[PDB]
Amino acid sequence: AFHVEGLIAIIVFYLLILLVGIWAAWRTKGSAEERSEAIIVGGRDIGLLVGGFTMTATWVGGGYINGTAEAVYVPGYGLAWAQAPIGYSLSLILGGLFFAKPMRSKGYVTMLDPFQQIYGKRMGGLLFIPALMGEMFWAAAIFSALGATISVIIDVDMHISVIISALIATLYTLVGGLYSVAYTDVVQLFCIFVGLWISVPFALSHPAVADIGFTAVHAKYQKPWLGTVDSSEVYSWLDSFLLLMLGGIPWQAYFQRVLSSSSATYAQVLSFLAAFGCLVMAIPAILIGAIGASTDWNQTAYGLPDPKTTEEADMILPIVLQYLCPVYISFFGLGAVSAAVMSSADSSILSASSMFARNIYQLSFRQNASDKEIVWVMRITVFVFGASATAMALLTKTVYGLWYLSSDLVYIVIFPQLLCVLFVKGTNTYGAVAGYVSGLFLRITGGEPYLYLQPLIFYPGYYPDDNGIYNQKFPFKTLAMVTSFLTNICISYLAKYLFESGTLPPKLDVFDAVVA
Numbered sequence: 207a208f209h210v211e212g213l214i215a216i217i218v219f220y221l222l223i224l225l226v227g228i229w230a231a232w233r234t235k236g237s238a239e240e241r242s243e244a245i246i247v248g249g250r251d252i253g254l255l256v257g258g259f260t261m262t263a264t265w266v267g268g269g270y271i272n273g274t275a276e277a278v279y280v281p282g283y284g285l286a287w288a289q290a291p292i293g294y295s296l297s298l299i300l301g302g303l304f305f306a307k308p309m310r311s312k313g314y315v316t317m318l319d320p321f322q323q324i325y326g327k328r329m330g331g332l333l334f335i336p337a338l339m340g341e342m343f344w345a346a347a348i349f350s351a352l353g354a355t356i357s358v359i360i361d362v363d364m365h366i367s368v369i370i371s372a373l374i375a376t377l378y379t380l381v382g383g384l385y386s387v388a389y390t391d392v393v394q395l396f397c398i399f400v401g402l403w404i405s406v407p408f409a410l411s412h413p414a415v416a417d418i419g420f421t422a423v424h425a426k427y428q429k430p431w432l433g434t435v436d437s438s439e440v441y442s443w444l445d446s447f448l449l450l451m452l453g454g455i456p457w458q459a460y461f462q463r464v465l466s467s468s469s470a471t472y473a474q475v476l477s478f479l480a481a482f483g484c485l486v487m488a489i490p491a492i493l494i495g496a497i498g499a500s501t502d503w504n505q506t507a508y509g510l511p512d513p514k515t516t517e518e519a520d521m522i523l524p525i526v527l528q529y530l531c532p533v534y535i536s537f538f539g540l541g542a543v544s545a546a547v548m549s550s551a552d553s554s555i556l557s558a559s560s561m562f563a564r565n566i567y568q569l570s571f572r573q574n575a576s577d578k579e580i581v582w583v584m585r586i587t588v589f590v591f592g593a594s595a596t597a598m599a600l601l602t603k604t605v606y607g608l609w610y611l612s613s614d615l616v617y618i619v620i621f622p623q624l625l626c627v628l629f630v631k632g633t634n635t636y637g638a639v640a641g642y643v644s645g646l647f648l649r650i651t652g653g654e655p656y657l658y659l660q661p662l663i664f665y666p667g668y669y670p671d672d673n674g675i676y677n678q679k680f681p682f683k684t685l686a687m688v689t690s691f692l693t694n695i696c697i698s699y700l701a702k703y704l705f706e707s708g709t710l711p712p713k714l715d716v717f718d719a720v721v722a
């Protein structure tokens with residue numbers, strides 16, 4: 207049914223989030239003369255607990271919670287394939303151990319600044335394109351998740367709620383800039399904690415749900431939610447787990463926080479603290495997914511068939527909140543999900559707009575530009591990116607598959623480039639271009655089942671799906687990343703050797719990286 211009392215509550219919650227963001231904008235209104243990087247990096251005064259809470263709320267979005275609950279819920283995957291929590295936690299631990307220290311110790315402004323200073327502005331933009339694509343598609347996917355969830359719970363028209371949520375998020379991130387998004391994430395993360403953790407005892411107390419512990423090791427209604435990994439599917443699970451471990455590092459939304467930490471040590475400690483917060487935040491998602499897996503849906507008001515029959519298994523968190531939990535607990539859970547989506551999409555929108563106005567515009571297009579012009583183009587870029595993200599979320603039905611493809615492409619392309627600039631010395635532009643081309647070519651020829659793209663190269667173990675398109679059981683993603691990294695090293699060293707030995711003319715080179 208349509209309950210106004212609760213729609214009013216969520217509108218009030220949105221207004222309070224916007225008011226907190228506006229207050230954070232007003233109070234902390236950076237450098238006195240250089241306000242171009244008083245929005246991007248925040249003035250380097252973000253502390254430890256605030257930054258940890260902020261970036262913890264950045265990774266915990268509604269798409270992440272719904273994906274974990276889906277992976278736990280469905281019988282084929284189970285908990286063993288719910289590799290999002292431990293994948294994110296190991297990603298953050300690995301980043302804080304190795305990548306966080308050199309990024310913050312010397313004062314970079316964004317993610318892409320080390321790429322430009324080594325590979326030239328053209329390759330800086332060429333690496334910006336996958337990052338922008340990934341951020342925009344991730345924001346669109348989680349906005350579509352919010353739209354579907356709110357259309358399920360309150361039964362609001364879907365094209366209004368996502369527009370209002372995106373408008374409010376864009377408005378406060380436009381007005382403040384890394385202080386309106388980091389002083390509201392300490393509120394949104396607490397709201398996520400409250401809304402997710404209160405609903406779990408209410409869901410468990412429902413008479414339909416019975417013996418959540420017993421369903422882990424035994425099967426009564428469906429396959430056990432604990433799940434298993436087959437002998438033949440070890441390589442695919444390792445491929446996806448490496449995707450989640452190593453593709454979660456090179457995002458703009460992560461390095462914008464580690465650069466904003468007050469000191470170098472409070473960046474690594476922030477990363478570890480958030481790697482603990484991610485598991486703390488993901489425990490309720492796993493519990494609710496197990497509750498949905500164990501629930502006898504005939505007893506509830508949802509009725510039979512169960513959601514996995516009606517192809518609604520991608521959303522099992524909102525159904526449990528709406529049907530198993532009471533009305534006000536359902537609104538608490540919906541507020542938690544909306545806070546998670548606004549936090550992650552706000553981080554993505556500010557992060558994707560913190561690369562456009564910083565280097566491809568200010569450092570590439572208009573090198574000599576006034577700071578006020580850069581601030582204004584930052585604000586209009588935030589607004590345009592928010593409008594594009596919500597329009598792509600609302601108008602396109604193929605957002606999830608494009609999100610997965612863009613995240614996989616970011617992992618294949620940017621991460622070898624990220625590891626080459628810092629850890630490896632003597633990497634040139636030619637090897638970077640060769641790695642880009644090889645990674646893009648292998649990812650395109652691998653194909654995607656969601657986009658109905660036929661794979662040009664058939665890896666061993668390929669099998670056709672129900673829709674009639676070939677799927678690759680071979681771990682071509684991590685193999686593509688390894689091939690890109692190896693060919694980056696090989697082409698860089700070969701070009702350096704050729705230009706040092708004198709086989710090629712010193713004037714023939716176009717990128718001029720080796721000579722100068």
Ligand SMILES: C[N+]1(C)CCO[C@@](O)(c2ccc(-c3ccc([C@@]4(O)C[N+](C)(C)CCO4)cc3)cc2)C1
Nearest residue numbers: 265270273344446449450453454455457610613614
């Ligand atoms: C079962 N499906 C629905 C289809 C098969 O693939 C999946 O297991 C799956 C789930 C999640 C992902 C995924 C990939 C990347 C990311 C992300 O890019 C998102 N963040 C940017 C939030 C963190 C870094 O990792 C999140 C989820 C990829 C595949 C999900």
